[PDB]
């Protein structure tokens, strides 16, 4: 008896996502007969990489409108700027999203007026 | 007290929120903005699993291990972003590998 | 005798025309032949990668039909008849 | 004989060594110069785990063969 301390696989990777909880998901996820012990770890970090990768863009964009609290528009405005990410989410739409300000040239004003 | 109590609705919010301070110590986030992220995870997340799944059949493996996921990663993510994702996950695995 | 002559130019000005016929195109501009070959490769590019990617994940040195298949499906192009 | 090791930071550590030098010796030298005790250390060669009793030429580790540094964290 007397298990005597504790340690979390997340800590064991020094990563913020609940390896344990994820590792639970796949077990019931009907995703395979068995779950490799290593996999979820690897699987976890990837998200923990992305989640930053997106938020970083937002935060910078959030500072741009000079509001200390991230909003959806930023996320939208963030995502469509990264030329890679847009192709990740292109099929996906965002609540409160809006779109990037964009105008076709020939529609621009003048004619020199 | 505590009637009929709302069973804890799990999110990644806290997890999200931790990451935020590491990249942006200053900035806050609105629940709606937060609500984006929480959903945002699962979508990618499910996309991943299903592909890991498909690998199993096509190799007739019964089990999803790490090697699976990575393969799917290179499929699912576009361009260079994948490699870093590959990198971080890899760098993670090793660091978790020697653990305990 | 060397390596690397032309390739992509090996899709011939008449050949594509045949497709265009099946495409229902009455008359064709000249510059089409350029951009056409541009797209074609670009398409084949990401397609091949995945089947390749599966293939190495199989630790097998050979691309099979099943490989090309699973490439198209997570692409969205899913095809029949060479699968299985 | 000079070799290197690459880190999570990509740090490239200069190493004057010999093919008969033990991993025991090597990490100690990294403990020596970088102050990081082996308890939290391991070095990688081509993904293989390094035991102290092994030397460099045991893995056919050549001069300027660069390695993958690890902080093995017990606790936390």
């Amino acid at each position: 008896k007397a298990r005597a301390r504790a340690k979390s696989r997340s800590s064991r990777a020094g990563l913020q996502f609940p390896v344990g909880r994820v590792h639970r998901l796949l077990r019931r996820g009907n995703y395979a007969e068995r779950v490799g012990a290593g996999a979820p770890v690897y699987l976890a970090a990837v998200l923990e990489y992305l989640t930053a990768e997106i938020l970083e863009l937002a935060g910078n964009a959030a500072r741009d409108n000079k509001k200390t609290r991230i909003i959806p528009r930023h996320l939208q405005l963030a995502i469509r700027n990264d030329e890679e990410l847009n192709k990740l989410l292109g099929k996906v739409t965002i609540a409160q999203g809006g779109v990037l300000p964009n105008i076709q040239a020939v529609l621009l004003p003048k004619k020199t007026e | 007290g505590k009637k009929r109590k709302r069973s804890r609705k799990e999110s990644y919010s806290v997890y999200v929120y931790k990451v935020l301070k590491q990249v942006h110590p200053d900035t806050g986030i609105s629940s709606k903005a937060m609500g984006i992220m929480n959903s945002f995870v699962n979508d990618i997340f499910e996309r991943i699993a299903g592909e890991a799944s498909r690998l199993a059949h096509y190799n007739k493996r019964s089990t999803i291990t790490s090697r699976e996921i990575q393969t799917a990663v290179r499929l699912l993510l576009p361009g260079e972003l994948a490699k870093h994702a590959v990198s971080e996950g890899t760098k993670a695995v090793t660091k978790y590998t020697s653990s305990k | 005798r060397k390596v690397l002559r032309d390739n992509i130019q090996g899709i011939t000005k008449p050949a594509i025309r045949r497709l265009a016929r099946r495409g229902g195109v009455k008359r064709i501009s000249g510059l089409i032949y350029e951009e056409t070959r541009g797209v074609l490769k670009v398409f084949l590019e990401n397609v091949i990668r995945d089947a390749v990617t599966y293939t190495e994940h199989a630790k097998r040195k050979t691309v099979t039909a099943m490989d090309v298949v699973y490439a198209l499906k997570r692409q969205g192009r899913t095809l029949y008849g060479f699968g299985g | 004989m000079q070799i290197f090791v690459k880190t999570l930071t990509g740090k490239t550590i200069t190493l004057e060594v010999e093919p008969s030098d033990t991993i025991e010796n090597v990490k100690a030298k990294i403990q020596d110069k970088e102050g990081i005790p082996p308890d939290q250390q391991r070095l990688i060669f081509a993904g293989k785990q390094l035991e102290d009793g092994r030397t460099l030429s045991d893995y056919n580790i050549q001069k300027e063969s660069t390695l993958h540094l690890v902080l093995r964290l017990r606790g936390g």
């Binding site: 690897y42 990264d82 890679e84 | - | - | -």
Partner: peptide, 21 residues
């Protein structure tokens, strides 16, 4: 040259990825 989940974790250039926008 892709691999088996090697230790090749090669580059901390992601800032250049972030530069892409």
């Amino acid at each position: 040259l892709t691999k088996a989940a090697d230790i090749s974790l090669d580059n901390l250039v992601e800032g250049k990825r972030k530069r892409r926008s």
